[PDB]
């Protein structure tokens, strides 16, 4: 299966802003802006932090933000600290009436 | 009207024999029609037989 | 609108000429409906009553 394109890992230092990237076809990422982002501590459930490419749910800190340009997207995090150490996933509107998700990106705060 | 399970209340799934362009190789085909365009063929209890 | 993601199907009926029908439906089933803003409609019917 396709399951989008997503990098294996990201690097950074505290204080820097980073992006978590996802890229796919124009149907899956670009035909509709329905892009959501999910986050996974090791051994925990995936957690809900970004919906409709750039909006935030109940109680989520406003440091996190989304972005999209054409057929790519990136969860933009301003001001890293060590608490962001987790795995990250993107999901988006699939081909026909489905949802498709990426391959996982590990946050490595050096 | 099992579209994706359930029942779509407006559209019936019907199948019919099409006299093809060769006219001696007629084949089965299927289409979805609206219930204003579909009439029961007879008043008897053969209620799986319909007409335009 | 018609909020029902329909799909066109092509059938060949006789020599050379075709016919178009409704094939599968993708996505969930939704009701066809039309919308009018309520305050403008009540204003319009009250002005029609005025006239």
């Amino acid at each position, epitope marked *: *299966q396709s*399951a989008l394109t*997503q990098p294996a890992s990201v690097s950074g230092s505290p204080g820097q802003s980073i992006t978590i990237s996802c890229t796919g076809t124009k149907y899956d990422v670009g035909s509709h802006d*329905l*892009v*959501s982002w*999910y986050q996974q501590y090791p051994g925990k*459930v*995936p*957690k*809900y932090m970004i*919906y*409709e490419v750039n909006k935030r*749910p*109940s109680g989520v800190s406003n440091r996190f933000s989304g972005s999209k340009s054409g057929n790519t997207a990136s969860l933009t995090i301003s001001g890293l600290r060590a608490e962001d150490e987790a795995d990250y*996933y993107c*999901c*988006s*509107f*699939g*081909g*026909s*009436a*489905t*949802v*498709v*998700c*990426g*391959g*996982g990106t590990k946050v490595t705060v050096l | 009207a099992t*579209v*994706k*399970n*359930g029942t779509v209340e407006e559209m019936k799934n019907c199948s019919f024999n099409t006299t093809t362009e060769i006219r001696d190789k007629e084949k089965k085909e299927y289409a979805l029609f609206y219930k204003p365009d579909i009439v029961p063929l007879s008043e008897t209890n053969n209620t799986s037989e319909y007409r335009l | 609108t018609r*909020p029902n*993601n329909n799909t066109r199907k092509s059938v060949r009926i006789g020599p050379g000429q075709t016919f178009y029908a409704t094939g599968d439906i993708i*996505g*969930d*089933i*939704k*009701q066809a*409906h039309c919308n009018i803003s309520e305050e403008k409609w009540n204003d319009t019917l009250q002005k029609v009553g005025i006239e």
Partner: nanobody
Amino acid sequence: QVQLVQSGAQMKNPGASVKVSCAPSGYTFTDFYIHWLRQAPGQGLQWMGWMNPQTGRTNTARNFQGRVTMTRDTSIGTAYMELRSLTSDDTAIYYCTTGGWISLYYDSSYYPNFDHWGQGTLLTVS
């Protein structure tokens, strides 16, 4: 807010088929779309299907055709997953999520807004 619960554990063998439950708590079950997703150990997240509990309609991924089927409950209210023709590679965690809001005037199935997550279950097949 609200919370879903799922089955405790599923250790199985190939060719046996698997049922997973998903009982909601805090909100009316026949209000939101219910999605089902799969996560392998050390592999990215897989989306498996969605189902409308109001109407009983459901759709799955194109790779999961025939293997994955789902039903609903009205008396108590829960979501039933049954996995068919499975092999050892389906040893994974299985998640039941609450999707978008059901309205009769526009489609809201493919919204990936998994607002509430269950605790999932483990399927171990070897």
